[PDB]
């Protein structure tokens, strides 16, 4: 069996010599200026846990920060609120951290008094780390809420079942909810999985999720009333699939913006969107001829299949963002088996693509565009979401606990 | 400020340090000290962590140091009789700016496992300085001192240090100093490596590996080093006024050029035994469409005023050429260099395109194009062949190198 240590201070944690299987229980209460360094090494069989006595009842206020530094560690039930970080990211997974996890935890309005002061709320480094059943809400200052920092090897991190709540408009770039990589690391493989999360009113900037590395999967998430887009910003071989981007008619709600090579966009429900051009439900950007990593790379071989676009201002925009510098149009790939209904502009072409196969796309538009057919394959509407009658399913957020287990 | 006297890493953690304060670590041999120097100072009043008596505060066993914050100074520490279990021995974090480590040493601080990777000093952040230190005897995987690149130039300064004997590692990753990696090679670094001694640094082919741009390696001594100073990745680097003195030692190489807009001037490259990639001045051949971790074509190298003497091979244009590396050096010049008592003045493995070779002087009977007989008077002063009108006492003869207490 394992030892159980009952503590109420970072100083007591620092004095423990933790072994695989140990559990450190942080007592219920409101503790200020806590500098928590969870530095220990567990094993697959015997993880080292740092848990709140009662989930959501151990609150870290003032200038509190958490560092997870080791292998097979688990942090569970903590809340950061009524404070801010003076410098470091609120929660950090070190580069030497692997197979570690933070669960049932929250960061709420943990804002620096200075809006221009940059820190992230959660930073992922190392490999096979997991962020699940957490709540990150109300960031008003500079910096992406949750970042995956890329390194020379893929991370294979998992970000699942979290609630990312309202994030107000930052007014400048760096207000993303999730950023996976940077331009410098954009040609590296990341393999991050972003699954079954809720992004509710994440309005920090243009990008809600900014992908800037390769082989990432954004699957089965809900983006509800988000003033922004899911952007394939830099990198190749990314997948954005089975997500519900429900704008609910909200001003400037955008869809999936495609930049770069070999990307797959499939099975998404892109409805109630108010965006156009770069904010269309499916936006396939124009690009530069000889770009630097931080610029725009030509869309090559996009595979856009089975997406249901409905009740939106603009369905697909091919060549969006075209100008004097960005003259390269999308090329290769296919735009097929999609459905575009009750949409003011079904398909706009700002830059004619090359070899992009457009076929079997059902629409209710009076003037059928090139590559589109008439709606006949039953499109039903269960839970305010226009779905295919035989593919009707209960959306993951109606039957799964998203955010901390102790919270409702 | 206040003078805090401590004898433990835990004691330092309990202090609320303010600008101008000084922490004095007690003389003695302290085992397994995990030192976390997290504090902030100012330009006028820095926070100092100093040994009670320089060189008499030893950290043995599994001891590490982290310098985390602005305007911090670490002084007089010795790391020996131990090893790191994972982390780099001395680390400046990314949040560290205007901080310094002086009069400190890391000696035979080796892991029992030759394959276990950690660096002895890692530089992150901005405007940090490593000076008057001694780093000697690394036998395990990993470069001795690393400059880790980030999105902004660091402008670090590495000066007046003694990098002592480093035995041959057997594999790559045995450099003395590496500035950057292939991923960050197109970023500007602006690191200055100046007035250091590299003595028998034999870890691998690269004593210094530049893998970022705008770095300057100036006025250093490379004495009996089994390796080269390589411009490995990146552009706009400078290797100047250095003394590479092989003393005839097997495989002592010179300066190896790869990439664009590099300047190699005023170097004294003497008693070298290398050839090909280890020639006194090697100008590599490269791939046509290289990825960042490969070889970029030498474009516009400016090689001037170097004095090559008593060596096996002077200049190798097109060194390393094979089926993959076919692109030869192009543009720039090779002028006003001297090649005396050297078995091969110039070896051409790949004819350069538009490389101007002119006004180079040699004592060789057969003159290559761009070469003339030695017209200027040369003197051998302090063991080094120099122009009689340009004689200077080498820096290491008139400056303290390494810790002041040693």
From TrEMBL, chain A:
<dbReference type="InterPro" id="IPR006626">
    <property type="entry name" value="PbH1"/>
</dbReference>
<dbReference type="InterPro" id="IPR011050">
    <property type="entry name" value="Pectin_lyase_fold/virulence"/>
</dbReference>
<protein>
    <recommendedName>
        <fullName>Poly(Beta-D-mannuronate) lyase</fullName>
    </recommendedName>
</protein>
<keyword id="KW-0732">Signal</keyword>
<dbReference type="Pfam" id="PF14592">
    <property type="entry name" value="Chondroitinas_B"/>
</dbReference>
<dbReference type="InterPro" id="IPR012334">
    <property type="entry name" value="Pectin_lyas_fold"/>
</dbReference>
<dbReference type="InterPro" id="IPR039513">
    <property type="entry name" value="PL-6"/>
</dbReference>
